[PDB]
Amino acid sequence: SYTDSYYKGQTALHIAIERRNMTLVTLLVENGADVQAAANGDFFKKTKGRPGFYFGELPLSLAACTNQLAIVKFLLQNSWQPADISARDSVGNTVLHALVEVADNTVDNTKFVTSMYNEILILGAKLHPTLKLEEITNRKGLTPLALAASSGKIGVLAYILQREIHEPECRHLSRKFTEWAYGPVHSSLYDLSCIDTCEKNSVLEVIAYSSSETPNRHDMLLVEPLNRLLQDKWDRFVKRIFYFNFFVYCLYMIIFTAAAYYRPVEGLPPYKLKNTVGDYFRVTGEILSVSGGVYFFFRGIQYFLQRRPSLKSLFVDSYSEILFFVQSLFMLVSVVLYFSQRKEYVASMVFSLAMGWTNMLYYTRGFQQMGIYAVMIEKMILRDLCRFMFVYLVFLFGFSTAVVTLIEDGKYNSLYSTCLELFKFTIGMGDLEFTENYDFKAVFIILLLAYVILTYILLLNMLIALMGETVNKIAQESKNIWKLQRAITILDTEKSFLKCMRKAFRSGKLLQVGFTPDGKDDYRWCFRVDEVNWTT
């Protein structure tokens, strides 16, 4: 057996299974080879930045991952040394986790992995009827379903959530339960366990709070039980709460604007109240405004502590939370400057006020029609302008310092004024009024016209072509983006909910099968779906 730091733990049984030699496997198991050896070398670990073969480190996992069912049945059933179906690796991944890891969302891989998963579950039920493999979590606390949801494996997820077995002695492993069928319509029940209420890590939490790299982040919500769940939750209670929140935010911004507009103009804050109506209403509005700022501040901190987003994806996701938090920061800095007796609180207040209105666009998310504008603004700012700033500032600074150096004595003799005027030229509102008497006028004109041609004509339209391409990229994807935002809203409304109830269930705690492997019956919170399909 290999003893190095690269192939640590690899042994002959792995080579026999890997080579697909039934005879050598039978002989090795006969001679007392260890059927639960851990090949955990760096070649065998789960990793992206190094070539390797991760299979779950175990011969049973290797057999399952390589599409060799006969060897699996041999290892599990053979009496020389039977293999434990529920063994786990150093990552804690069992055979089912290993099977999830080797998916790649292709047709043939889906067929292989779905088949092997189904067969292993049936065999596991037969060998250990009291064993529940699907509830075993790996080291990260993920069940195989949660791992599939996080990884974006659409095929495995679609199979599991719509799983049905028409066979006694393993029917309790089904999740989809067809109750009837008519011509185009059929009514079925869906198991729903650990979709909504798992208390540790549900499927919807995993899909919603994924890190935007997941290959099928938005297609996963089209899988039928999830889509029906989100539609039911939306229509049932969440929609009203969302509209109420939007209305309350509108009232808050109206009060804030009215209070801000009527600030006193006298020097040296803070200002003392006179026994007059306008002062009472103004101070009331101020208190409400600062209250709203403090509320959004603590909501922002709670979000960041709960999610723990990384710096690399801090802005790629969580754009809206960052903007609401920055609004809160400007409000608090304004309060600090206010009671510190400085006029400069006006400056801080003003920025928050401006932000307060544009954050209203957050509420157009979740509309099929309107959310595309918020999404387009986000992507344009985060990609195109942030990349383009380096190029444009190189041009601006180059010609700016050139012109400042050339010119002595005038309005174009300081960095500030010349940078502002060159920026004006770039957005097409300059003057070009070459009417001043100064030396080197020809070179000045050549520089300025070169700048105009380079930035106004060329670079600006380069930027516009790129932004237009970005918009046409996501003209098509509106339907999925809408659903994903709706899902995030539904979960966020579920979490707080401000009533002490957690009525997050759909249909009754119905008896699903009634016939466990033991004499008990299973009640499982099934959810009814009446589907229609006009095929044939």
Ligand X SMILES: CCCCCCCCCCCCCCCC(=O)O[C@H](COC(=O)CCCCCC)COP(=O)(O)OCCN
Q: Is 388 exposed, middle or buried (0-12, 13-18, 19+ CB in 10 A)?
A: middle
Q: Are 372 and 474 in contact (CB under 8 A)?
A: yes
Using the rule CB under 6 A, give the single segment among 179-187, 220-228, 332-340, 410-418 that binds ligand X.
410-418
Torsion of CA 26, 30, 34, 35, to 10 degrees: 40
Residue numbers 159-218 binding its own copies by CB under 8 A: 218
Q: What is the rounded radius of gyration, in angstroms, for the C-alpha atoms of the chain? A: 32
Is 428 annotated to bind a ligand? Reply is yes
The number of angstroms, rounded, from the C-alpha of 424 to the middle of its chain's C-alpha atoms is: 39
Is 512 annotated to bind a ligand? Reply is no
Q: Is 481 exposed, middle or buried (0-12, 13-18, 19+ CB in 10 A)?
A: middle
Of the residues 70, 389, 464, 504, which one makes contact with ligand X according to CB under 6 A: 389
CB of 256 vs its own copies, minimal distance in Å: 6
CB of 431 vs ligand 6EU, minimal distance in Å: 20
Q: Is 141 in the site for ligand XPJ (CB under 6 A)?
A: no
Looking at beta carbons only, is 119 or 378 nearer to ligand 6EU? 378
Q: Is 453 in the site for ligand 6EU (CB under 6 A)?
A: yes
Number of other residues whose CB lies within 10 A of the CB of residue 189: 20
Q: Is 475 in the site for its own copies (CB under 8 A)?
A: yes
The 125-164 contact track toward its own copies, x by CB under 8 A, reads ----------------------------------------
Of the residues 414, 461, 496, 516, which one makes contact with ligand X according to CB under 6 A: 414
The 297-326 contact track toward ligand 6EU, x by CB under 6 A, reads ----------------------xx-xx--x
What are the φ and ψ backbone dihedral angles of 258, each rounded to 5 degrees?
Answer: -65, -40
Q: How far apart are CA 84 and CA 77, in angstroms?
A: 10
Q: How far apart are CA 62 and CA 81, in angstroms?
A: 17
Number of other residues whose CB lies within 10 A of the CB of residue 317: 18
CB of 452 vs ligand X, minimal distance in Å: 9
* Partner in contact with 389, chosen from ligand 6EU, ligand X, ligand XPJ, none, beta carbon below 5 to 8 Å by kind: ligand X
Starting at the earlier edge strand, list the strands of the sheet with 185-190. 176-181, 185-190, 527-532
Coil vs helix vs strand at 276: coil
Nearest CA to 125 out of 85, 70, 182 is that of 85
Q: Is 475 in the site for ligand XPJ (CB under 6 A)?
A: no
Structure-block tokens of residue 472: 């046409």
Number of other residues whose CB lies within 10 A of the CB of residue 51: 6
CB of 320 vs its own copies, minimal distance in Å: 24
Coil vs helix vs strand at 190: strand
Is 514 annotated to bind a ligand? Reply is no
Q: How far apart are CA 408 and CA 418, in angstroms?
A: 12
Residue numbers 397-436 binding its own copies by CB under 8 A: 397-399, 401-406, 408, 420, 424, 427-432, 434
Looking at beta carbons only, is 158 or 422 nearer to ligand X? 422
Q: Are 89 and 56 in contact (CB under 8 A)?
A: yes
Looking at beta carbons only, is 242 or 425 nearer to ligand X? 425
Of the residues 159, 338, 362, 527, which one makes contact with ligand 6EU according to CB under 6 A: 362
Helices (H), 340-454: 345-358, 371-379, 386-406, 415-426, 441-451
* Partner in contact with 254, chosen from ligand X, ligand XPJ, its own copies, none, beta carbon below 5 to 8 Å by kind: none
Structure-block tokens of residue 176: 């989809």
Using the rule CB under 6 A, give the single segment among 50-58, 127-135, 409-417, 471-479 that binds ligand X.
409-417
Is 483 annotated to bind a ligand? Reply is no
* Partner in contact with 429, chosen from ligand X, ligand 6EU, ligand XPJ, none, beta carbon below 5 to 8 Å by kind: ligand XPJ
Is 231 annotated to bind a ligand? Reply is no
Number of other residues whose CB lies within 10 A of the CB of residue 135: 12
Using the rule CB under 6 A, give the single segment among 29-37, 121-129, 355-363, 476-484 that binds ligand 6EU.
355-363
CB of 348 vs ligand XPJ, minimal distance in Å: 32
Q: Is 419 in the site for ligand X (CB under 6 A)?
A: yes
> Distance of CA 449 to CAs 262, 386, 406, 442, Å?
47, 26, 15, 11
Structure-block tokens of residue 491: 């979960």
User: What count of residues does the chain have?
Assistant: 536
Q: Is 434 in the site for ligand X (CB under 6 A)?
A: yes
Helix axis angle for 319-339 and 277-307, nearest 10°, is 140
Residue numbers 414-453 binding ligand XPJ by CB under 6 A: 428-429
Q: Which residues bind ligand 6EU (CB under 6 A)?
A: 319-320, 322-323, 326, 351, 354-355, 358-359, 361-362, 374, 377-378, 381, 385, 450, 453-454
User: Residues within the annotated binding site for ATP?
Assistant: 7-10, 18-19
User: Residues within the annotated binding site for resiniferatoxin?
Assistant: 319-320, 358, 365
Q: Which residues bind ligand X (CB under 6 A)?
A: 385, 389, 392, 414, 416-417, 419-420, 423, 434, 441-442, 445-446, 453
User: Residues within the annotated binding site for Na(+)?
Assistant: 428
